């Protein structure tokens, strides 16, 4: 019984900066039996509206949030 919510995604960014690839990997195909497109579509609609900030960490782009 696993569900995806905006609060859950933001929680990770609020605690530690992460990348889109890392976020998707969390529920890419671990347990949730959701289609690859569906998984991205759900997080995309939520993340896309997130309009967060980008930071250069280890020569890479990461997502960070400051409530």
């Amino acid at each position: 019984d696993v569900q995806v919510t905006e609060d859950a995604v933001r929680r990770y960014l609020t605690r530690k900066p992460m990348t889109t690839k890392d976020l998707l990997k969390k529920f890419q195909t671990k347990k949730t039996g959701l289609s690859s497109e569906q998984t991205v579509n759900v997080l995309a609609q939520i993340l896309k509206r997130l309009n967060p900030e980008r930071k250069m960490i280890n020569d890479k782009m990461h997502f960070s949030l400051k409530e």
């Binding site: 889109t20 998707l24 890419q28 690859s36 995309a44 993340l47 997130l50 967060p52």
Partner: peptide, 21 residues
């Protein structure tokens, strides 16, 4: 390489936020 199609799976997500970025 060992991976390819899987990488694109995440690219779609980044493509969205890429706008507001």
């Amino acid at each position: 390489g060992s991976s390819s199609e899987a990488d694109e799976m995440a690219k779609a997500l980044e493509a969205e936020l890429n706008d507001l970025m």
